[PDB]
Design a binder for this molecule. Structure first.
Ligand SMILES: COc1cc(/C=C/c2ccc(O)cc2)cc(OC)c1
Ligand SMILES: COc1cc(/C=C/c2ccc(O)cc2)cc(OC)c1
Ligand SMILES: COc1cc(/C=C/c2ccc(O)cc2)cc(OC)c1
Ligand SMILES: COc1cc(/C=C/c2ccc(O)cc2)cc(OC)c1
Ligand code: NA
Ligand code: NA
Lengths: 115, 115, 115, 115
């Protein structure tokens, strides 16, 4: 698993299930190229986004649709989405876990990077 | 003001107002002695807990009554309180700001220490 | 002051000083137009980005240059920047405070919205 | 796994390995009774703290020795320890995951509670 995203709900104390996200990779003209996509499972996790061979050096953006998640719970949130922008694989392959902890007016994100 | 506490509400996007907290200092017999207490203002801040003369070296604990805060909003939260335990003034007097960001199943705390 | 940003450093226990950030507003053609920019003060705060007249309804993005901040401290951080994307003034003028807490592999952001 | 604790390092982007913690349960005289103990594995996780039969209604405190963790990295941290105090099993058994994200001057904690 070169890239996995885990999403937690800080209000309900649960995984954040069915959270949609897209992953983009910055192109040479500084535009965002589509790269991967999916939605979180019942464990709050999204696996299988990419393969080691396809996941090369670049600047990547994970755009998580947190607004739709809160709206489904009848809560008006602050953010349009949560974005996580990072350089990956600049020293060769690594495995990346992106974790996001969600509240209506706040989010916290961290990365675990393993060789 | 050598010690100030600021509390924010991540559900409502507001200062956390009227939040009670108690400060303790570890005594020579290793018990927690009462040191100061108060409630946050309309800005989510609690000033005036102590003075430079009274705020000697020691181990201090701030216990923020997050449970009563959430219960008054009709929410059953996870934590009994949010606690911050730290050594203060080890190397001479410092000014401490403790900030806490609250959600029903999560809290995040940080300190700003200035000379 | 309808928009203020405060940045804290979780490694050093200090305001994050001299942190650059750029604010964008989504244009009618869905592109990000420059709106305002500045750097945090010695208190970690950036005031004066905009005015009530200029800060109309819209989707805004604050991009905080966390990478340059960590690199100047000799740290190679994970994120390219910390981003906050939000709809503002949907239901009339509001005052927004965005707070960001920074670590090399993590950031946490919250908003306080007042009428 | 009725009770699991997961600890992450926000500075290095890694699990926090070999982090010691003790779990206490509040007794009738309001003192803290020893309940469980251990240290995190190479994945940053501590499993096997208790069994369903032993883990009954009570107020529990997880005291995580974050200070020793930072000192091993030559970093002087703010907190003496990170504490997580919560009522558990008041509506019968649940499974609890306590997550803590550590920085030298900050920690963030959340709970995942599953029936
Ligand atoms: C403390 O647990 C909470 C659960 C919830 C659950 C809200 C919710 C809304 C719609 C649903 O379909 C399910 C849960 C909200 C809370 O603060 C707003 C706290
Ligand atoms: C809104 O003004 C403030 C925000 C904050 C935000 C603190 C904070 C704590 C934990 C987090 O995860 C994010 C922000 C701190 C302050 O100390 C003076 C003032
Ligand atoms: C960006 O990754 C970092 C790694 C580290 C690693 C520190 C360290 C110290 C002692 C050790 O034995 C291993 C790592 C520190 C950082 O900011 C202080 C950032
Ligand atoms: C419950 O299992 C996990 C919890 C967490 C908690 C992450 C987190 C992120 C931000 C915070 O402010 C607090 C915890 C992370 C994980 O990484 C795979 C797994
Ligand atoms: Na001393
Ligand atoms: Na409107």
């Amino acid at each position: 698993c070169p890239l996995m995203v885990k999403v937690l709900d800080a209000v309900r104390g649960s995984p954040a299930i069915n959270v949609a996200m897209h992953v983009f990779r910055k192109a040479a003209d500084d535009t965002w190229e589509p790269f991967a996509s999916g939605k979180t499972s019942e464990s709050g996790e999204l696996h299988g986004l990419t393969t080691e061979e396809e996941f090369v050096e670049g600047i990547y953006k994970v755009e998580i649709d947190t607004k739709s998640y809160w709206k489904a719970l009848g809560i008006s949130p602050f953010h349009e989405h949560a974005e996580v922008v990072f350089t990956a694989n600049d020293s060769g392959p690594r495995r990346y876990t992106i974790a996001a902890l969600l509240s209506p007016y706040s989010y916290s994100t961290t990365a675990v990077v393993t060789n």
